[PDB]
């Protein structure tokens, strides 16, 4: 139904910026809830922020742990979503994948990886000290 694809990761020094972006497939973009998670080697995957379906307004919700860094934002013209990543810190290296829902605009338990029903790839990004 849904196809997800990250770009945008690499390599980059602390106090930088990356923004990664997921291009998406599936006819009803704008009805779906969208996320970013991230997997540091070794460690479980994280919720990192999530952003509303349109007809919910498109809200945006964040872990706390990130102290306002990071922006999620949808472009439902081009079927795309984007994380900027602002002031970048070593332990911010990981894998990040989007992930979408086509069944919730909106969820309780947002920050939960068992409720989206579709995943992409992964990008890698290392934060060097
Ligand atoms: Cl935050
Ligand atoms: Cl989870």
């Known amino acids: 139904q849904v196809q997800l694809a990250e770009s945008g990761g690499g390599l980059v020094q602390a106090g930088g910026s990356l923004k990664l972006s997921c291009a998406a497939s599936?006819?009803?973009?704008?009805?779906?809830?969208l996320a970013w998670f991230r997997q540091a080697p070794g460690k479980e995957r994280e919720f990192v922020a999530a952003?509303?379906?349109?007809?919910?307004?498109?809200?945006?919700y964040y872990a706390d742990s990130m102290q306002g860094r990071f922006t999620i934002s949808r472009d439902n013209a081009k079927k795309t979503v984007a994380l900027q990543m602002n002031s970048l810190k070593p332990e911010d290296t990981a894998v990040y994948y989007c992930?979408?829902?086509?069944?919730?605009?909106?969820?309780?338990?947002?920050?939960?990886?068992?409720?989206?029903?579709?995943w992409g790839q992964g990008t890698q990004v290392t934060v060097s000290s």
């Open positions: 992930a979408a829902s086509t069944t919730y605009c909106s969820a309780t338990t947002y920050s939960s990886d068992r409720l989206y029903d579709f």
């Open positions: 952003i509303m379906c349109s007809g919910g307004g498109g809200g945006t």
């Open positions: 599936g006819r009803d973009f704008s009805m779906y809830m």
